[PDB]
Design a binder for this molecule. Structure first.
Ligand SMILES: Cc1cc2nc3c(=O)[nH]c(=O)nc-3n(C[C@H](O)[C@H](O)[C@H](O)COP(=O)(O)OP(=O)(O)OC[C@H]3O[C@@H](n4cnc5c(N)ncnc54)[C@H](O)[C@@H]3O)c2cc1C
Ligand SMILES: Nc1ccn([C@@H]2O[C@H](COP(=O)(O)OP(=O)(O)O)[C@@H](O)[C@H]2O)c(=O)n1
Ligand SMILES: [Mn+2]
Ligand SMILES: [Mn+2]
Length: 554
């Protein structure tokens, strides 16, 4: 039926500058050596990304989907949501969020400057009163940093980002913000993924695998998900929102937003030229993650009914998906996943990689992360969440005039603290730099789902214990997979081997303990793995005092 995009063929122009790599990346050139392999996407590769995401889509709904949708709209019916006040909505604007054509910006919006408050009042009135005219959107390349893959044809092209004006975005929060904070949890329950700390996520997969008598899991990511959301998906989700107990002013605005923005609108490049028209999900609206994750839930859950996936347990993070279910022999299980894929493709959510039933939890990957196991001193199996370190390393090497990679180092040390690569590579380089910089106690930002939290480098031991527990400073024997992947990435990036890092880590332990105080606790804990004779670490009193709830939620 419907064509995802159409293109006037104007360029997808960049937004401001696109910083270049420098001839010395002086923070990360003691980390890895092949700074050529570390590249950043760019509006140049936008034309190529355009060509891969455009295609006529044909959706084929059936009674499994119809059944599922109703059980979800009934789950949504249990919801009460409230409008956000124009001012609440305003103060949710991120401090550096892209400014408005009408000369004002995140600065003024969060300050409740009267100029903006007015123009946003006039936006929201026109939202309620006119429920048809399209809302112009801006399309721009997305810039993000990757390592090259010569197997994947070199350098990825830049993901497309489409978003409305800054005044608009605040009204989406007035109409919809409250729903984003409740509906995914009300519809899916524990199937909802973005509520779990890494350890909590691991506990869930473990709980699920254990309660099958013969489990079988697989993962599913949809190829170019933002472009396979059809106009009927986006309206079907508006009727999921409308299932909720809402005030009448909200429903009007919601409906107007769906008709005028969400189901599609003309896209403008940064120079203003009409760039094309969009008939799919704009990645950039408030509902981008709620909408993906819920649309994904039904499609995948209906396709589950359609394949005869037995006793399925689901974990949905955006378009990524894990399904630990009941096995029907290796022979039938294979057959079902084809039915799954076919069903999904019939729903306009075709995969990039054909799913495959797996029977070993380490071999199942989704959300770029997998589970894994290590022994401790106790000879006892401890499970953790790890991932391919090739990209986190690459982003640890992004140094330009304008961006310093250290926040990224924090982010990883926090998120994948138990990993052999964080413990032995990142943590080593982190403190090694901070101490020489003599900024070991200057605060750092840790970013996650758009929230930023203030984090001080010397608190890392108690933070990591509240999130991962003391077992994180005692991982004895890593899996043969992890050992191979970590080795493999260090080679691929010209970083020194893990043997080397053990020598350098010994040193950082010395200076850290020799600074005493908090620095010394970082030594004895974060680098206990490094020493011939391990100190018996005990709980930290600070750990019990920490509130890390909203970190890994939404
Ligand atoms: C609602 C939401 C908002 C986010 N906002 C920001 C932000 O403003 N600035 C920033 O630097 N990072 C943002 N992120 C990414 C976030 O910081 C983490 O990196 C995120 O958990 C992805 O982890 P990952 O790279 O291992 O998953 P991935 O390997 O990237 O797999 C993709 C899955 O994770 C989600 N995801 C990954 N990257 C993003 C992204 N930029 N935006 C939205 N979803 C993403 C997708 O929903 C998808 O389900 C956001 C993530 C979510 C889910
Ligand atoms: N940096 C990012 C990455 C993904 N996303 C969204 O989350 C979805 C995840 O899809 P993905 O990461 O597997 O890549 P695609 O399949 O969309 O090409 C995207 O379609 C986008 O809608 C985003 O909004 N910002
Ligand atoms: Mn995808
Ligand atoms: Mn994905």
């Amino acid at each position: 039926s419907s064509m995802s995009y159409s293109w006037t063929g104007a360029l997808i122009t960049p937004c401001g500058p696109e910083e270049e790599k420098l001839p010395i990346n002086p923070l990360s050139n003691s980390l890895l050596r092949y700074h050529n392999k570390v590249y950043c996407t760019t509006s140049k590769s936008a034309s190529q990304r355009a060509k891969k995401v455009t295609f006529d889509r044909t959706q084929v709904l059936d009674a499994h989907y119809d059944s599922v949708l109703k059980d979800i709209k009934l789950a949504a019916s249990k919801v009460s949501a409230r409008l956000l006040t124009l001012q609440q909505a305003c103060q949710l604007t991120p401090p550096h969020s892209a400014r408005s054509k009408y000369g004002f910006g995140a600065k003024e919006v969060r300050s409740l400057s009267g100029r903006a408050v007015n123009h946003i009042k006039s936006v929201w009135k026109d939202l309620l009163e006119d429920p048809q005219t399209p809302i112009p959107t801006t399309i721009m390349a997305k810039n993000e940093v990757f390592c090259v893959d010569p197997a994947k044809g070199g350098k990825k092209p830049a993901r497309l980002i489409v978003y409305p004006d800054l005044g608009v975005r605040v009204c989406e929060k007035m109409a919809l913000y409250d729903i984003t904070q409740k509906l995914p949890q009300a519809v899916m329950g524990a199937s909802y993924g973005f509520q779990y700390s890494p350890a909590q996520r691991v506990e869930y997969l473990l709980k699920a695998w254990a309660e099958k008598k013969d489990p079988m899991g697989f993962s599913y990511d949809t190829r170019h998900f933002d472009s396979t959301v059809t106009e009927r998906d986006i309206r079907t989700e508006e009727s999921i929102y409308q299932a909720c107990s809402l005030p009448e002013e909200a429903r009007t605005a919601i409906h107007s937003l769906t008709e005028r923005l969400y189901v599609g609108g003309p896209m403008f490049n940064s120079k203003g030229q009409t760039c094309g028209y969009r008939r799919c999900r704009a990645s950039g609206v408030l509902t981008t993650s709620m909408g993906n994750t819920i649309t994904c839930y039904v499609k995948a859950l209906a396709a589950c009914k359609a394949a005869g996936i037995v006793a399925p347990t689901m974990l949905v993070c955006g378009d990524d998906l894990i399904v630990i279910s009941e096995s029907q022999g290796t022979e039938e299980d294979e057959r079902n996943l084809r039915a799954f894929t076919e069903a999904m493709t019939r729903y306009s959510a075709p995969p990039g990689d054909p799913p495959r039933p797996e029977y070993d939890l380490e071999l199942i990957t989704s959300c770029s992360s997998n589970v894994s196991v290590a022994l401790g001193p106790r000879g006892r199996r401890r499970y953790y969440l790890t991932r391919d370190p090739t990209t986190p390393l690459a982003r640890a090497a992004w140094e330009t005039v304008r961006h310093s990679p250290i926040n990224s180092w924090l982010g990883n040390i926090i998120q994948y603290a138990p990993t052999i690569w964080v413990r032995m590579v990142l943590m080593t380089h982190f403190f090694s730099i901070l101490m020489v910089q003599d900024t070991l106690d200057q605060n750092l930002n840790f970013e996650m789902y758009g929230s930023v939290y203030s984090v001080n480098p010397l608190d890392l031991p108690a933070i990591i214990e509240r999130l991962h527990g003391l077992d994180a400073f005692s991982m004895h024997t890593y899996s043969h997979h992890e050992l191979t992947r970590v080795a493999s990435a260090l080679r691929k990036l010209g970083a020194p081997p893990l043997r080397v890092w053990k020598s350098r880590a010994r040193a950082v332990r010395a200076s850290l303990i020799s600074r005493g105080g908090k620095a010394a606790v970082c030594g004895r804990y974060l680098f206990n793995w490094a020493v011939k004779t391990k100190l018996k670490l005990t709980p930290l009193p600070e750990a019990r005092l920490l509130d890390l709830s909203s970190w890994f939620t939404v």
